[PDB]
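Figure S7 source data.
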Amino acid sequence: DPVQRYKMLIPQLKESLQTLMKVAAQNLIQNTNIDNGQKSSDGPIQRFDKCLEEFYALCDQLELCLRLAHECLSQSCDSAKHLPYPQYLAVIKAQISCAKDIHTALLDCANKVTG
Amino acid sequence: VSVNLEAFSQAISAIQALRSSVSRVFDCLKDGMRNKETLEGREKAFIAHFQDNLHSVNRDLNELERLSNLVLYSQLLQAYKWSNKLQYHAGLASGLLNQQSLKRSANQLVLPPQYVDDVISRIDRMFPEMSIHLSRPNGTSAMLLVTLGKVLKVIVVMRSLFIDRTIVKGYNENVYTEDLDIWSKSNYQVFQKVTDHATTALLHYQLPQMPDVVVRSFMTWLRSYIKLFQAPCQRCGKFLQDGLPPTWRDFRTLEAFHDTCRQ
Amino acid sequence: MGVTCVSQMPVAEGKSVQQTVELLTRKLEMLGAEKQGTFCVDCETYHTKLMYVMHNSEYPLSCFALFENGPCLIADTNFDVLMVKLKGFFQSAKASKIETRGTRYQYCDFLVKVGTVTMGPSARGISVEVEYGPCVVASDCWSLLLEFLQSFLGSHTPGAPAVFGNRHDAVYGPADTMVQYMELFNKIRKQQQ
Amino acid sequence: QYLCQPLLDAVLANIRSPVFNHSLYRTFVPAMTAIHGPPITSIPSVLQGEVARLDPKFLVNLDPSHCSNNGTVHLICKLDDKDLPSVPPLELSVPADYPAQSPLWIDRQWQYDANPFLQSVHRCMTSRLLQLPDKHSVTALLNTWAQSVHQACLSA
Amino acid sequence: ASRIEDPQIQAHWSNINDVYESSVKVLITSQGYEQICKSIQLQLNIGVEQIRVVHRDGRVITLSYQEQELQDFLLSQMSQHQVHAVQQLAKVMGWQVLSFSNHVGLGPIESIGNASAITVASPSGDYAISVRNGPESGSKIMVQFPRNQCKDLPKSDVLQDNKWSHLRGPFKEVQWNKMEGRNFVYKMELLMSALSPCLL
Amino acid sequence: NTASLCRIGQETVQDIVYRTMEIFQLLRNMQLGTYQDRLTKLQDNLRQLSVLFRKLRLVYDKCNENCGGMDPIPVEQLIPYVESEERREIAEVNKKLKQKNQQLKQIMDQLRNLIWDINAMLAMRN
Amino acid sequence: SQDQEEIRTGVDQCIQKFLDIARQTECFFLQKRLQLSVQKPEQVIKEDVSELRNELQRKDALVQKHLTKLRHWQQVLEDINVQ
Amino acid sequence: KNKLFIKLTRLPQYYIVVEMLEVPNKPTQLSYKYYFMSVNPAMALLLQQFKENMCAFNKVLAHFVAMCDTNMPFVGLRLELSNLEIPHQGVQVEGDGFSHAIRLLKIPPCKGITEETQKALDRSLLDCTFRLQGRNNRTWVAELVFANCPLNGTSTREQGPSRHVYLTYENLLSEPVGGRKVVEMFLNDWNSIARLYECVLEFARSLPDIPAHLNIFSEVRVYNYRKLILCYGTTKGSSISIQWNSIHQKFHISLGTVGPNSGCSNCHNTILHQLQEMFNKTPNVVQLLQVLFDTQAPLNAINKLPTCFSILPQSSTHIRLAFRNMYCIDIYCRSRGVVAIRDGAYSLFDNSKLVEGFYPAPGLKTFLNMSWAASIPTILTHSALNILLLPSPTPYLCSPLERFLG
Amino acid sequence: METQLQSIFEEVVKTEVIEEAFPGMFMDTPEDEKTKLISCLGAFRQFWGGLSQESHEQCIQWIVKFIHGQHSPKRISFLYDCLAMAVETGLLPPRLVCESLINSDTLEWERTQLWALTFKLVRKIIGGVDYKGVRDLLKVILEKILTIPNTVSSAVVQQLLAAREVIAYILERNACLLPAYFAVTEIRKLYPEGKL
Ligand SMILES: [Zn+2]
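Tokens for the predicted zinc ion complex:
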């Protein structure tokens, strides 16, 4: 699903870049002509601003999908790294808490000795 | 798997690069040409910068397409993150601080044989290619026969949990297998040079207090002599200088060098 | 047992059989190589299938009997005496004996031997063997033998031998050197011209 | 090339238009500033260094006797060491643009003559200048002068 | 060990020997700085007719039964350990090494052993030290005082600015005799502390 | 007196960095009985480290407040360039230690000879 | 307090600063030692006296331990060798 | 025919030839002649006699061998310096007798650097002494000594106007000691030093006129001529580092936390890429200090959210937050301590929903925390942002904002 | 043939590479100026006596472009001493040397040491030219002096003034290198009436 979505958006991102480049070229040519001798048709034109925001929207959607997948994969690998299941989670949280007590003790002592 | 994690992390940067590169193309165009002191120079500078910006957008888009192919409860995650952080931080700190030690003097052995046996067994557990045979023919001083593939047969002479003498021999050669041939030569010049380099490594790997990491590093450096007669010299490129294979491996850098070609 | 390679080097041009060895051996001496004695390899044949018995001088007491693809027996010299005693019972063949006699040159742990398979009374050809006593492992010590050969042999350097055959951690054997010698000998006997 | 080309074509059309920026500016100002938001929140030095980094044997100074403070620098330096102080001036004319036109020593044979040691030092130092590589430096001339004096001390 | 006392000497004979072989472990440290001054160590192999030396830098030397050869070799090794001591001390006191040559070729042609060479700079810029020890002529140390500090250097009119008056200049020599401490390393750190920033 | 207090201050500042290095190594080896031992070791290290701070501070105060009469000469004016009963006690102690060192050298020579003779015999017996 | 590059550069900076200031305090101590040795050549002599006496005491203790071990092994060997 | 060929292993292709000759008057003595040979089927190139001023050491032989081994590596470096049009003095004996050094006079000025900065650099480079050290004699060190340092640091670097930087180069085992890569890397480091001197000169010129908040907010700490470590924060805890990577030809900033009061990170690691690009487009450090001072306060609040909430880093001062995937919100930081929040998924143009969609219904919650009218922004104080984002118990310790979206 | 002269003159003034490492330890005084000049003059005499008349001048153009291609002024003055003794001994006709020296386009006034040494050598060797050659040399020297600006640097003025002594030597009436009417005819052809 996260890999699948990344695949789905990539063709769209290429399409959005193509339109944004083409629309920019049409707008610049019309603006130069208006200034220049050439008088160009009013036409549909299509606004450059709308395309540039669309490209940014697709970029955010892709980054959000990848960031979630990376966070989910990192959490899974860490979970694997660390008889009944309730006692299992109990001893894990107990180890986690005793490490935190050691942390707090070292911190408070090293901060009370000086500074 | 870890390879998937890296591909996702690389991809996240590639999306950020594509967005930044597209913004750069438009942002630079808005500023437009600059005076540049010359007509030719100003035209060239604008074209060169625009083309570099346009190419960067293409390169960044291509990477994203290629990267697609490759790929009470919160406190627990907080503890996991802090454990990883402390591990990395303390590792880096210990490395940086033991690399540069300000200790200048000491003034301001007896060891259990079973402890040495346990250390040797732990070292033999790793490095599956190497096989170490413990034996005590003469006193508590241990003598280790270390077989490295069909390549080497090293004779380490422990006096304690300490390395004192090493004489490597060939695989086809006879260590006499019995009362151990401590005093002999390999009859081949290459293995004699390897004995010299092993004594040099012993004199190099000398930790003051801890007697285990020294043996660990010695065994790791010996294990590098498994690509002998196979990996050429990293200075001259050939296999043979005066009919010798490269018999030297840099400490801190397990590479290959003829001893005439130094470190 | 140290990895070895044997190849035949053609005399070329109008260089006489002996003239070429004289030159090749001087080229080996020009490697800083020092002579370490003399080597004689004398082989006899039997038309039984086909039997081969060869004995390198490097090995003082062994006599090797090789049965083509079949196993090689490394036996003591009394083996030749048993062979002679059987002789009336045994087949004999007709003057197929082949010998290569040449100087041995040592270059820092590599022994190079260049010799002229003199057939019977008339020399024809040349056999080069480079052996590495330190290299117990074989089939991947090929890079070494190849580099050393390109150093002195240059052209006509062999692209390995099949005695290495299938990639394996199997140690090189005195039997393997003898099989190389047997293929080389079959080629001199039949190269003709 | 791919996917960008018309933009490239467009700007390659419209260079050398004087109004050019206006047009770019107009069509690219609002969207960007809407999306990203508001905008942003005497003597050359090489000779001086060469002098500062000499060996304390030499005591180089300027030359106000002939050309002074003009550009190329004439120098009478010295020889002060355990060696010999024969003819300390060795007038050296370092031309402008120092990393070229290697400086030339203005010869003065009037003082180096009427004395065997001085004739020998002159001969050997001249030969040493002949063997010196092209584009030599001032330190090179000073060192070859010193070593030529030393050769005259030992060879004689 | 009895005659030469300045740097150090040590020997740890092996436990098991043979009838045609033996081995020692020679170390040349300093009197006070044992930790940092651990750059030169030897492992002699006393054969039936030859003594084989394996240095820590990967150098194997076959000596003779002639005592003079071994004595000269050990003297040269002590001379080299003397400069290695200064190097390891500069590494610890944070002094920046400017140059280090194990076998220098500039100077007087020396005895049995080739001379050594080191030059370090003070952490706070201006000051710097240089050391040249050899088997025959050794302990030639000279400090590099900064300019505008000696007040005896002849000034020049070409120097018209005060920025050039900060470079390390007159190269004054120091007498290693009539000094404090009891070891080359003791005297070297006392000299380093003397050329340190006065935090008293 | 003061010259020895200065050496004490030197050894304290040379040892505090080693103590911090040992503390770093202990925090590194602490991966998640043995936890109690690691904790009490870290606490003892911290206490001894604070004691070392106090010692170096007090010796600093001592050497700073001492400032004996003989210090008018600033640094760099002391390095020598080119251009009673205490000595008798020193000589007596030197002669004593020389005699003791000669005796200890004789003892070491005898021990080395003994070890070499035992090793040679036990090697040739085989 | 209450990825890899951050901790990397942080430990670099703090460790290098700690090393520099430690080497500076060592330099200050060495300067004080040099001054006290050059201008008060009597406390250093007392230090040498104390060090030599401590060395002599350590040597005496070592030789005593060696003599005890030697007497033990002498008795052990005298016990054996018998028939 | 009685000669010895002593090859130099460190510097190859150089061979000393020591020939022995019989002396006529003494039938029990020998004479030695030393020649310097060189090789390119070995082909000799040039040959030159060199024979001018216990008995088995032959002192002059070892002396000549050591002299050759020490001097010959400098010849290749001199040739390489001459081949790249770098004016350099010849190999000179240093003042401490024994040595060799190649003191450069002028460097090739630069590429891509303004003329006035080139002048400021060329008038500050006092010496560029190169020296050789290291085992096997293949390490080079160049000591550059600059004068008139623009700005000092908190460390003990406020001494006399002479800053000494040591640049070390160790070529590979092959590619002999005298080669092109050493001087190439040296020129690359010089170019990076110049491109950094640009920014340090700009900052030194802008130091007298400061908006008077960044002066107390930020402080310079070290200046090693290849790195700029500025430190900012209320307690001077956070640190930013400026450096020019010649491999990528772009400025590389590295952020860290050095100070005994801070969070778990520099708190700016979520905007590192946009800050990289920002400094790459316009190399000005005062703008960096300003944007950091403006964006630190909202970042301290937006970093403590539970990680549900996802932080999408958009362009600078435009950090995006998204509860789950359905909801979104835009953070527009501005000067004078104000943040404008938006509806998120809403579009700044024709009223259509984005790919995420799911228009956030309430909207007016942001108004009380002071139809489609969530799309227009709503400014705050950074203190109302602290209240809106720091987890308070409920009027489990959740935020106000996540209670709203929940 | 120009390859032959190339090998000759390049082998004259080669520089030693391996010197300045182990300085002055090589057992050999490099040929001082006199022996080097005699050897150079001998080798060039071999090539010159071998050479044909029609080929007499293109080699001289190569010699002067090789001298003007140099950079060290000691090298230039050594080869100019070689050319001076090659003219003085009678080997070279003393008109081709002067013409190819001045008409060489590398001789510009910015090469001030080359300017000074060149016009010093022409002052040495101009006394043997016949008078028509002295007239053409006068014309080309005046046209060379005419390219200097109105203002030049204050250090280069004395080395620039070396052409003035050649001009003063030609227009000197007691030396009588040429009839003075020819001199004023060339001058008034170059500075007509009304021109300073
Ligand atoms: Zn090699």
